[PDB]
Structure 1
């Protein structure tokens, strides 16, 4: 119940535990979605902590996140996917993944248009 601040974030972004999130409903393929986040000084959603990002339990439908398959799964920044964070489930043949609740990743062709989530970290 103790009060603190959250951010810094741009005003039009949701802030939660010092990460900034923005939802985009205009459907784009994975690459176009990544480019859109980058144009906003951001990246596609990166899942690094179930506790610090527990708001993702409330995220419904299916959205691009920054997770890609190198033919291991890894993020845009080049870091690998930590274990016990996401359950990765096959769906459509492809090398990208859609976030869905709760902490699931559905494999999807990178060229399929989807909604997407951008995230900015503050540290």
Structure 2
């Protein structure tokens, strides 16, 4: 995969350096023929955490009527939440965490192959 993207077997990931709000992050991944990182089987979050310094990264997870993976099922994992108005999901070394969608954060894109 291209420069700035890193490979893990069959998976190609983009751990952004810049920060964007949730919607712009979703759009950046699509525009690059990829998608915001998801764990649709609700597995692998703890493991993946070993790749995340100390910052939070936007992932394809949102709460519109309960937490859901973008294009996937309902979240079955814990997500630490500070306030009820935090409706978009992020990941960091200690697990999943909610944040207001307008907040600029780094994001992670994923593409297969």
Same fold, judged at TM 0.5 (above)? yes
In structure 1, the partner of 2:110 is 119
Larger radius of gyration: 1
Q: TM-score, normalised by structure 2?
A: 0.81
Computed over aligned residues only, the root mean square deviation of the Cα atoms, in angstroms, reads 2.1
In structure 1, the partner of 2:11 is 19
Q: Aligned-pair distance for 1:82?
A: 5.3
Q: Larger strand proportion, structure 1 or 2?
A: 1
Q: Aligned-pair distance for 1:112?
A: 0.8
Q: Segments of 4+ in structure 1 off by > 3 A?
A: none
In structure 1, the partner of 2:79 is 88
Query: Could you tell me which of 18, 42, 50 is aligned with 1:57?
Result: 50
CA distance in structure 1 between the partners assigned to 2:15 and 2:33 by the alignment? 15
Cα deviation, 1:41-97, whole Å, max 9, x if unaligned, reads: 01111124328x8343231210100101122211222x11453xx430012532101
* Unmatched runs of 5 consecutive residues or more in structure 1: 1-9
CA distance in structure 2 between the partners assigned to 1:87 and 1:26 by the alignment? 27
* Unmatched runs of 5 consecutive residues or more in structure 2: none
Aligned residues, how many? 108
